[PDB]
Write a protein that binds this ligand. Sequence first.
Ligand SMILES: O=c1[nH]cnc2c1ncn2[C@@H]1O[C@H](COP(=O)(O)O)[C@@H](O)[C@H]1O
Ligand SMILES: O=c1[nH]cnc2c1ncn2[C@@H]1O[C@H](COP(=O)(O)O)[C@@H](O)[C@H]1O
Lengths: 208, 208
Amino acid sequence: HHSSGLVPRGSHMQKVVLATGNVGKVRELASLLSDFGLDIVAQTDLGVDSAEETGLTFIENAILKARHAAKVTALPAIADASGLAVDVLGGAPGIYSARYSGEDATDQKNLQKLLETMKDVPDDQRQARFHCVLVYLRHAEDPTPLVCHGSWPGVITREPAGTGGFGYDPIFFVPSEGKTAAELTREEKSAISHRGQALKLLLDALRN
Amino acid sequence: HHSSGLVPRGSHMQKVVLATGNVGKVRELASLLSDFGLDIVAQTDLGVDSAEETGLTFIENAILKARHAAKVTALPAIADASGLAVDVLGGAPGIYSARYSGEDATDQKNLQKLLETMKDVPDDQRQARFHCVLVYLRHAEDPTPLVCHGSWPGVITREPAGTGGFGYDPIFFVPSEGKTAAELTREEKSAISHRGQALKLLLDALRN
Ligand SMILES: O=c1[nH]cnc2c1ncn2[C@@H]1O[C@H](COP(=O)(O)O)[C@@H](O)[C@H]1O
Ligand SMILES: O=c1[nH]cnc2c1ncn2[C@@H]1O[C@H](COP(=O)(O)O)[C@@H](O)[C@H]1O
């Protein structure tokens, strides 16, 4: 159902390091988990450097990141790992999503490379999902982290459309919405995305 | 919901290597998945040697094993990782379940060591679960394996009772049954165990 030590029992807060220094992600999560008694703090506030993302799956990377933060802070740790996985490319860009076009990758060059890679893919074989894996480790050596995996299916376009969001959003067409992820508003994207799903799953698993 | 390539579509069979040479596990799984069109084969039939279990979680080990088999056979791969996690010991024996008492570990010496480790644990603080994590990788570099995690709660006894099963069964008391895992029959244990749960989850995720 999932074991003890994920929430405090329980007038006090439990401090939990989030494995990012990203203030937006930290604000979002601290705000959601607040009510469960979790005091969420960026790993950067506690002097944690970036972990080397050496895993070959989102789950392995999320766990590696969470473990590094927990090991350096001696706190329980939450991490995420996210990316785009294209069926016809066996799940690529996958764990190489952020760095797909190499050293000096940028969002645009990443997406442009994905279009080039997919230029001869038939129109009906362009399925893809964004994935967000969240993990929660009680301590660095916890053998049974909670793991929350959200995903969001779409289809890769042939040209970019829209300027909202980030990353591959301009080429990720969402047939249920009749537009790309970058044409959605932030509120509209948040309601349906892989990250929205994984947060819902997490909040719901901590209820429990 | 979970992506393509886990079942064939679909008069043919898809061969899938199970990451064990254990004939009982292979018979059980081949028999369950048969109907879904999966042709399950022990990794030992295909000449796969044991992978080094280097991960610090059941999920990391199950994935490592599945990836090694898939990489050596070029087949999709299923693996499991299982063990006993005791709350008061932070999840130990955990990934060291099979080897808990070291080099030349046996079931009995493992369990006897767990009793010694837990001898001063109050009677009401002896919670534990067995965990079984099953994973299914489409190929060695698949970034989004299916992951099925079953667990089974119990309480660690102060003495062994019963001679059925294996491993820590003689000291894992199951309050809903009023006996230890080793006092259950094989059919009774199978119906409720961490492995029973993970198989149910897998069979149900392949339905889908
Ligand atoms: O919502 C999203 N839209 C577009 N691309 C994303 C999204 N989430 C993850 N990605 C891609 O996956 C990478 C994930 O790295 P992270 O954002 O560092 O976790 C990002 O750099 C993007 O390349
Ligand atoms: O059903 C069970 N009963 C008792 N111990 C188990 C069970 N499943 C896993 N274990 C323990 O966890 C280890 C798991 O290793 P595996 O059986 O090699 O997957 C076993 O050697 C036992 O030590």
